[model samples]
Target chain A: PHSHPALTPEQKKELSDIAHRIVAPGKGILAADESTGSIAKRLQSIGTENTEENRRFYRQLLLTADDRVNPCIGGVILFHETLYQKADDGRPFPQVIKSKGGVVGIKVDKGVVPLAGTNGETTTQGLDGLSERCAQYKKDGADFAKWRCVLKIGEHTPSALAIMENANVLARYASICQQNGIVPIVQPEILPDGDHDLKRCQYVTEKVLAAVYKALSDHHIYLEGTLLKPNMVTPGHACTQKYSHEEIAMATVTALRRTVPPAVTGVTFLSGGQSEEEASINLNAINKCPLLKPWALTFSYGRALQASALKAWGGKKENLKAAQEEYVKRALANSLACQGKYTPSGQAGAAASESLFISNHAY
Target chain B: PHSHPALTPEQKKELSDIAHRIVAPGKGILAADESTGSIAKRLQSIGTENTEENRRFYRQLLLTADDRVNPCIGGVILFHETLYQKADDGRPFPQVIKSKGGVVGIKVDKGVVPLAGTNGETTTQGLDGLSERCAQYKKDGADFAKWRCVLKIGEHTPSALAIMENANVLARYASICQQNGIVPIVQPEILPDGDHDLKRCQYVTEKVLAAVYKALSDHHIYLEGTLLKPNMVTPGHACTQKYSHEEIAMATVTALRRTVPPAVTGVTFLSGGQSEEEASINLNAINKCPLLKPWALTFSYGRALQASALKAWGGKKENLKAAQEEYVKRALANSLACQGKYTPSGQAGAAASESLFISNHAY
Candidate 1:
């Protein structure tokens, strides 16, 4: 009675297979599920209006990027509006993703809500009606789901309440998604909004992920059916300390190895406001790290993949080809990075060098 | 950087003092903080109308019990309305409790809220505006606070989200209460509502308490200043298997010793649907279990203390003295029980034999 296994052998194998496929060798996820507000900010950055057509065009560009990205992206996550929206050729985004041999995913959470009695901490909302939503999403071509819950570091921030609450919500979302045959990407992103050092971030990440896995165990969730989407362990944005990509990789992988279970299929990391080139370099370093990783380690990047592409587009339909080309370059770079084969380019353009850091990013 | 203590040295000392006093020696707490809805059921059970006068009178009967109770009860928990209510002699309940050498505690949580995507599991609410409310409660003479978050045992009950959310919320509540000089009694009661056996309950209790203390540590809550009100480890109500008191004691003490920090002031066992005598017998056996219990182990019972008294009162002023006698008897019995000195007696009569178990008790 004390040991109730969360899933049957068949359920375990099914979930394991789906999760493995999403991070199958040399591939990662394309996070295109920007909330309306977040997408608006992205479009506004390039002086483009946040219209459904523009969103569709941008998503289509990334999804339809020549075979270069087909091997790079094993999964494509779509925002609700974009999931049902038609591309220029009148194909739904999900169908387009499927045609490229990529699994379709959806962002299921509504957004974050304030956790009172906390020092500016919040837990993700949208558990309400989530089961039904998962069932519908599974039927609508989504084989995976993303629910992000954020935690921030400060003097008294990322309180236990925030960490546990967020982790628990993510587990609940995961459990529901699994019941509906959609692999859940459990994302508990800790914000780099403080002046803390790398050790501090690593410490917080370890504790947060430990709590998350224990919660999943308690909830009877099938770990093999889930993927972990976590922040790469790094110093706060304003920290005085400097670290090499190797050091960052060591810290990130070490933390995950300590807390995440081997049953989980993979770790698909959020680029978390890192520059396009920096993100790729870090992925390369992570793949090169000497530590033994039992699960797939790959990317689930949004800003890192889109920063250069959005700049290339510059809100002009005439630049669609150019924008797609820019996106394809990053995808190929990351694909090689995940395999520890990407070499840094000396003449990588200004777009690749641009810092994409946004304070308290909510994509 | 990973270990940021939430309280200053002076604040820690203050909270520690208050918590220790509430479970000093053989003394425990009287949990009278029943919500109006809860008390209405109590009143209706005795064929009395659920009115302010009746509630006040009932509380007065127990509070003004003979001097024998002064040493037995270290604290008295009052609901918001009762906190301001005056005894028959016109002294406020807080003042009366103070006069009796007992700490005054307030129930701070509004109530439990359902967690979406669970098998009817819930997380506690009432965190909004908690700091100011705690400050006022402190000023109004509340030296401690009570917030209950319940879990249950079942096929897939007490899911991971429920355990983590409840533990985190309790820590959040404790942090705020400590900030305002109120020692918080962290109650995470697991319901006896299933057919699971002793080992199952013990396993669940261990996991739940481990999560609770981890959350408290992560939140930087001062463990020395806090009290734990947990359900004693016992088989579910419907279980066909029966265990000796020694077994229950072993399970309860073993679970607490494994998870609870020695720094915590006390463990006040909630008599979750246990009979008065059974609760006392269990406490006595716990004290005699020969285990090294670092914290004070005692009772913080509501129904277990009031069951016989309510029946004696019968909503009649003429029976007030009889009701007070019944309450005093249990208090003295529990006091001796907490010290492992109580000797069971036939004179303990009908009250001791009465089953106080109420299905899914809410108070």
Candidate 2:
């Protein structure tokens, strides 16, 4: 490919200006929209049904809940199916979410494909015809695109092939999305999938994110227009040991702080199956931790915000208020967490104390 | 992606075996197939006709050339459209060439895409869905793959974007092809397209190849199984003066010697718009130059080998025999040139004696 069109001095400055604004201090994402599959698993532990309308009702409740979500959720990432779904009054989910002040984004990756010859880990694949797809999604009102590339822990997981391939794909996706004016949320999630220690995850995370940002630079992507949706640095899911939320938050934030470029608009943490409370508590600690946070450290969670909502909704209209209420509480908690203000002691009667694990989940 | 089943020690040995056989000692490629576009311009210069049959007949003669052509011609890269073409006797082109003991290869790039914001330059595409495509091509009898990424000279001509994107692409392409047992010729051809001195081209070429090889390593691609198709260091076409063939050879060989890893199978120089004689002479000089060329210094010429054949054929069946003969002569010459045995006196006599200058070209 040839060189890009020369961005005039003014245009370049303007682009830089836009990048700085998105990463402004004290702002971060509140990931309230969990895919139904994820929500169902979270709900199954607490005996809740998983259905489309139930999911929508729960999300709609989060979107309409007391206006506090906007203060912390810079962008609301919707699954492909949810991008077009509507609320009870037939309002598009993104419209309702956006109308209340949030950037409406959509996940663009087609889940994952098993990496040949590796441990049973996978890389994201939606790139077959991504450019055109991104353009269409943008026209449909998505201001950003999200791709999740999953890696696991093994004797030699996050191998060079996985790291390079994932980075290249993310870079390719980001460049294409930017061409049509959509910010790209690059998320290469090194899953907490094994008994690996926190240091291992952090090491992999640093190397992976470094590869990613280098790729972004290589592809000439505007860092200002791109955001990162990354897993917080934490131990593998099957570890027998319990770790404090503060420990998880410190490790996660330190990794991001060290590697992610300040030019990136924000760094939204993927709950990666953390419990609702764990997600909020971890994010809150990250915000509260004393480190040079370069980008906005926030949440782009699914179950962390919607598990209880789904259980309360039970796929029924009567439960809508309760579901909305559940979602709102999580949203409020995440908002406070985003600014390092969330406190577990403040929870009234919420299941904020419950575990949210489901093994080898499919959602 | 996880590491593929580790190439059984035997598989690793086998891959290295094939590469070693192809690039061993004084061997190099004889790139005889030029695209219709490339051939058209060449034919236009010599006042000859441009037609498919004519092109086929020319390539047939070259492919069917005597054993003399096989001595230096380790491989023959065919454009997709020509890979299945036939000899006048209806013999498959690949069959004839392989029968003559040449490796049959295919060029897989989809041409260049502008790099967006640099001086006039481009990166080759064809990577979207390339893994599946490589599998099919390998199944179709292609023992190797070739992707030519074009770069030129100017202020910031080969910006980091170009270097990084092309390197990543080439490495990715190599990795995929190797996984399926096909050797890949990683060609990042920095076009000698400006009026810059030979040193500039050499410097850029060295930097470009360094990045390409490092990326290959970063991606964990086995260099021993890969071939490099590079441009020989030479002054731009519009330069008002000329350098001695020895000077060009010294610059070219030193650059390749310094950057390309010893493990790489070979270094085949693309005769980027040079006259057949200049191409062969330079290859000879490169071999004779006082430089430690760890990889095979060979010829991968297109116009350099076909200009005479195209002129002799003049797009007519009647001239097929003569055209084929010319093709044989040029092939034999390059085969010899790869052995550093071609004499400067053996120019494409009468055929292109009158300065074969294709405008905006660099030899």
Candidate 3:
């Protein structure tokens, strides 16, 4: 056979061990892994410089958020640049995260490529010489890898083509990563970018995850060595329907049960267009979901975990402490939510609750 | 347990029996299942009136093809209108086909609907109240159902969304049909609609079939109870590189090996844009492929089996005999081809081989 076979039981054990640590009890992943280009635009929108130093400073603020976020943080997924850059104290970001008892992960995909036949839908492309890249990253203080594939809810989405291709790429990358001793976070995020209702969203999400796990199986991927980072099932941001957190949680959990295998260690959800506060509330409801959740459900949010912090910093050096303070607050809040222990409404204790500031990275 | 469960072994045996019968030995399918509007367009192309009478006359000419085509055609797929219409002798077309030693199939899909988030890609929309439709068709002498989903070749075409959605719909429809005692021809046709070469087509087909089967599994579709009606692998017609029949067979066979499960009873390939002669030659070559093939490889062609006949008839009563003569010739040619015995080249004995008359029914 020309291809690599399924991972050995020994290898599977290693993968599952790393997977469990990242979603340990009340902990979740901190998705600080935006590409340089993505984070730069995020910086520009904040009235801050898009310089490398500013990017370094902002990430450092999130990572150096003292003891408040220690138990809340399970892992810090880093962009290629941040994985190597040094903090102000000359410690690498990976080292700083390790000192805080957090595992480190690398975002390995090379961003999205427009699928030629889609209605502006895209699939990620990073498999070019990817095996060697995974090996290199594994040795560079990264215990896991994140590859993001994007989907959207539209009149006829998420199309089968987008779902199939994206899941395949994610699975192919996972095979390579686990072979290199890195757990893979299989993230296929369907954006809340349409006027679809919660039911419609559930239909698409169910189809997307169903297709993803099947691809994972096709590639002989080790399920225990992988984590799913899916978008929490919710109505499109522009939908006319309003649903409570419980409704959203029911939709998300039901969709997961239909597609995600129990063998997968955890599901760390992406916060698509959700306010930081809404993200925490949703995570709380998801944990509180009455369904039999076989795997851990937790947050692996990007903008939702850092939107308020990004706002507070405003690229000014004097606001760094405030930004870190806001970051730690959301971290603690979500940590409690994952354990079904969150209280205080989004209105009462939120640092900010404006719907996610970025709109599908239209930037 | 709110939804349907897997079919019983008895149901599986029944479905597989129907599938095997339709592709038994050297027999193939004659895909005369064009919608009224579609065959209407094809009629006008020949300067014929798009009247119900003329449509009936044309369909009569096909099902009324003599015993020369008896061993060649195992099944005749009919449109909704045709299935109910009678031949000049007053027998329904389904009865006409069965009288000629053929099984009957219905084109169950309503037709293609644009996927909202795709670049003009579409999925079939036939599953609306489909189970009832399938039950009705079965009682009307149809033993199998055909659903068509369209895909294409482009620089970034066959997006996973299109593939995923199309396969899922096909699977869903298959499940409905199996429950109604009708085997399904799970057809996901990727058109030769680009300038892509053979390799790209093969890649897309493999992905499409793999996804289709996975969806079938998810829906608990009995593979042995279903037939795959895939597009024969070939480069886009406008591709700069020319490939031999042997190359096309290898590509088609290789793709099938990777994705199609051995449990499928047969594979009936759609002709896409292939000429009648090329289609027969390709089927012959595919049967002659070096790889071990588990299922029968046969034709379920529309244009390739009817283009010359349609051209010869020209909607004139006097030419009806000539039309049937041409159709039967191709039928036998393809029958022999399915058995790896086709010898007359596309140039030597072909009735008509003008690169298929329509441009993907661009209408």
Best by TM-score: 2
lDDT (tens digit, per residue) of candidate 3 on A1-363: 012346776988888899999999989999888887889899989988789888899999999998889899999899989988999999988999989889999988888889998788899988888888888888888999988888877766677788888888988889889889999898888888866778777767766776776687567676778888888888767665556788888898877765654557789988876788888888998889876676789999889889999999998899988888989899999999999899844443334342353244323
Task: Provide the TM-score of the second chain in candidate 3.
Answer: 0.94
Give one digit per residue, the lDDT tens place, for model 2 in A1-363.
454554445644554554344344444554554566776775566554676765665567667766755665566777777788888788888788777767777777766755545656566666655667887887787777778777777887768777877888788778777766677778888877877778888899999989988887777778877778888888777554456767777888778877887778677778787778878777888888988786777767776877787677665668777777787777778878888777887453123232233233312
Model 2 lDDT per residue over B36-94, tens place:
89867866776657778766756776677667657656777888878878777777778
lDDT of each: 0.85, 0.73, 0.82
Looking at candidate 1 chain A, the ten consecutive residues that score lowest on lDDT are A354-363
lDDT per residue for candidate 1 within A64-166, as digits (tens), equals 8987678889998899888888877888788888888899999988777555446667877666567678888888888899888899998877776677677
By lDDT, is 1 or 2 better? 1
DockQ preference between candidates 1 and 2, better one: 2
- Give candidate 3 regions above 4 Å deviation: A1-174, A177-213, A216-363, B1-4, B345-362
Report model 3's TM-score to 2 decimal places: 0.53
Number of the predicted model whose lDDT against the real structure is largest: 1
Model 3 lDDT tens row, B1-363: 012446776987888788988999989999998887789888987999899888888988888888889888889888888888998787778887888889999888888888887788888896889989888888989999888888877755677788778888888898899999999888888888767788778867766776777788678677778888888888876677989999999989867755664557789998877777778889999999886675689989888888889989997888988999999888889999999998874364343344343354554
- For residue A59, model 1's alpha carbon misses the true position, in angstroms, by 8.0
Off-target runs (Cα >4 Å) in candidate 1 are A1-3, A24-27, A32-182, A186-223, A230-264, A277-298, A309-363, B1-3, B17-28, B32-182, B188-221, B230-267, B277-298, B308-363
Interface RMSD per candidate (angstroms): 6.8, 4.7, 11.5
lDDT of 1 at A10: 83
